[PDB]
Amino acid sequence: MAVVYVISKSGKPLMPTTRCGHVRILLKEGKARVVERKPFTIQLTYESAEETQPLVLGIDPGRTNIGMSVVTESGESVFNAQIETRNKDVPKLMKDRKQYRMAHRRLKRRCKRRRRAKAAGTAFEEGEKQRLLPGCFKPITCKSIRNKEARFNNRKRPVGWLTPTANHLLVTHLNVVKKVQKILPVAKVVLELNRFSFMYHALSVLNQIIPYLADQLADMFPGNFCVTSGQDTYLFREEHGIPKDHYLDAYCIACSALTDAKKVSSPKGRPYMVHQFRRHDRQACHKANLNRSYYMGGKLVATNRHKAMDQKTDSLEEYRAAHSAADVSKLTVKHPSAQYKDMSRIMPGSILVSGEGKLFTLSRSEGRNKGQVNYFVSTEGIKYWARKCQYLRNNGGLQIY
RNA sequence: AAAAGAGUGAACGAGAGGCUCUUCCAACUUAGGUUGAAAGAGCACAGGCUGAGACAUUCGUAAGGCCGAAAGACCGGACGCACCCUGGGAUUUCCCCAGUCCCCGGAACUGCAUAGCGGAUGCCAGUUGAUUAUCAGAUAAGCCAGGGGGAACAAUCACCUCUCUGUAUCAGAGAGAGUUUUAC
DNA sequence: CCTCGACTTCTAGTCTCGTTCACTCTTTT
DNA sequence: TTTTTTACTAGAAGTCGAGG
Numbered sequence A: 001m002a003v004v005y006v007i008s009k010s011g012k013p014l015m016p017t018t019r020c021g022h023v024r025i026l027l028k029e030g031k032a033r034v035v036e037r038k039p040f041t042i043q044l045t046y047e048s049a050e051e052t053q054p055l056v057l058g059i060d061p062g063r064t065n066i067g068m069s070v071v072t073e074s075g076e077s078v079f080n081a082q083i084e085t086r087n088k089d090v091p092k093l094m095k096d097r098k099q100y101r102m103a104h105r106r107l108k109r110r111c112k113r114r115r116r117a118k119a120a121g122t123a124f125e126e127g128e129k130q131r132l133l134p135g136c137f138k139p140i141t142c143k144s145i146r147n148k149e150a151r152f153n154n155r156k157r158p159v160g161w162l163t164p165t166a167n168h169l170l171v172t173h174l175n176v177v178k179k180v181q182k183i184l185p186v187a188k189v190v191l192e193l194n195r196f197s198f199m200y201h202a203l204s205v206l207n208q209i210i211p212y213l214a215d216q217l218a219d220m221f222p223g224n225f226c227v228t229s230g231q232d233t234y235l236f237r238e239e240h241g242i243p244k245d246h247y248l249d250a251y252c253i254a255c256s257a258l259t260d261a262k263k264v265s266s267p268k269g270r271p272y273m274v275h276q277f278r279r280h281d282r283q284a285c286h287k288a289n290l291n292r293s294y295y296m297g298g299k300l301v302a303t304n305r306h307k308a309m310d311q312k313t314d315s316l317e318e319y320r321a322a323h324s325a326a327d328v329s330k331l332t333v334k335h336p337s338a339q340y341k342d343m344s345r346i347m348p349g350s351i352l353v354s355g356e357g358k359l360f361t362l363s364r365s366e367g368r369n370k371g372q373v374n375y376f377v378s379t380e381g382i383k384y385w386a387r388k389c390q391y392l393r394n395n396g397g398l399q400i401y
Numbered sequence B: 001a002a003a004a005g006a007g008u009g010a011a012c013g014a015g016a017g018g019c020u021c022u023u024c025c026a027a028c029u030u031a032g033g034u035u036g037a038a039a040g041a042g043c044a045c046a047g048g049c050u051g052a053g054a055c056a057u058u059c060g061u062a063a064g065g066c067c068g069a070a071a072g073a074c075c076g077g078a079c080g081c082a083c084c085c086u087g088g089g090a091u092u093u094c095c096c097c098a099g100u101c102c103c104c105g106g107a108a109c110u111g112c113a114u115a116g117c118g119g120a121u122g123c124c125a126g127u128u129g130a131u132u133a134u135c136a137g138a139u140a141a142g143c144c145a146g147g148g149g150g151a152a153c154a155a156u157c158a159c160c161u162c163u164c165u166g167u168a169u170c171a172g173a174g175a176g177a178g179u180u181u182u183a184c
Numbered sequence C: 001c002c003t004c005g006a007c008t009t010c011t012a013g014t015c016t017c018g019t020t021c022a023c024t025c026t027t028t029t
Numbered sequence D: 001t002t003t004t005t006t007a008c009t010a011g012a013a014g015t016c017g018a019g020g
Helices: A021-028 A090-120 A164-180 A205-219 A230-239 A246-257 A316-322
Strands: A005-007 A032-037 A040-044 A055-060 A066-072 A077-084 A128-131 A140-143 A188-193 A225-229 A272-276 A285-287 A300-302 A351-353 A359-366 A375-378 A383-385 A390-393 A398-400
Touching: A021 A032, A021 A040, A055 A164, A055 A246, A066 A164, A066 A246, A077 A164, A077 A246, A090 A164, A164 A205, A164 A272, A164 A398, A188 A205, A188 A246, A205 A225, A225 A230, A225 A246, A230 A246, A300 A316
Parallel strands: A005 A040, A055 A188, A077 A272, A188 A225
Antiparallel strands: A032 A040, A055 A066, A066 A077, A128 A140, A272 A398, A351 A359, A351 A390, A359 A375, A375 A383
């Protein structure tokens, strides 16, 4: 039945097991010591032999659902996972980081300098200046003063420089291989090299990282790194009739390297689920409201005084056109103040226990009153009064649900 | 090889908005208040680093062409600069990285020449201690700031059986050796 | 009969356009 | 000539009881 992973006293991933009774007696015997609650690992506390039979790990690459599966040689299944990456958030978080940065460098230096210039009388006499900068053919308009040197001509990257979003995917894939190697004694590694010519979109960073992952996983398993092919995976899924399921593809990718695989049966049983939680959140501002709202009878009648970029709702300007000065003289303005996040908060991914004693993994902290989170939501979707909950462990990035 | 695809990373420049304040006008209610128009001034995660580096004007920036009466222009690429290299930093942290930036070296490489750098002149800081000196302090038109890990940190008993309560379920609590051994 | 409050319950968050540059992977041919 | 709507965290408004 269940498979209880085992680790040597020396901390060496030994073969797991499936005896159950002995895995309890041996816990009551104290001989052992839980090392993880899921997947259940038990480190022996009586140094014994550490024999470990050969195991193959089939990695099915992917940008949001990395799938892995360690299989015995006969073709038996000892582990099956389905990692859900956060690779789709990294790209957008960086676009925002850019806008934010460019704003800081426009509203806190450029303008300022342009303000201090006009004030000191140290500004272009024309007030504007077209400047054809080396590399461009169309000039750039500089108001009041010149432009901090633009650097876009010879910025060199190391060879094989991969973009933040791609690096992430790669590391992830490998970080998961390392977590699997701390529970089971992995020997060889099969990877399913994918292929998209480009001739629910994405499917791009994977094509760029597949090559680098293959190299990296060839040094992690020196002399033991094979590469299958989606096609083979399919041929297998019709040859051994593995019920088609995105998560049953890794078992197939892995069962390929196996030569005399006699006991190849679909790896039944729901596969473990791993969620990736961000490690650092250096953002401090939750919302800077940015809106001067007007309220005649306490109801918005002007979100600004004049429209803004993409502002659809009417602005005081429109109102003044529709109503009178006796009307505009009664309006009430209400601009809420910027809301800053609590940058030392138990971060989504932490492990906590409820007042009743249920252990859970923070998914999101909903609510705040008098400076105290109102509810800690679990990854299962239950809401617990934070005030009563207890902190146990911080985020680990890849966290099994 | 190009050719495209398909993502994703830089630097610099402009706006619409916004915040505060001033002046003025109008409106509306109690000299006052509220609101708006117009003009002006300042301000732009929380922060960390550093004391100056910003701006303006002017001059200087290789030989080699080649064209000019010349002056000069144009090409070129230096004994010029560099986003390039070597080293060292700031941001920077439990432990790392990215990015950006900075400081001395500049060989190759790579880039630029209306750029960049340097000089000159102008204009924009802060001065107090602890002790002429030294060590703090003060001081921006300095730089970086909304990216990625990893470690460590349990009130971590899973699975099978029985009993009890709830629960349409399922869930909760208690006890248990269930075939050895991770390999007879 | 309120009201004071422990909690529920629920909504909401900036945006666009200039002058350039980059590196990495697939495929076409 | 248009690439794709995500979602945690903060804070205001609301309800349910206390209770006196």
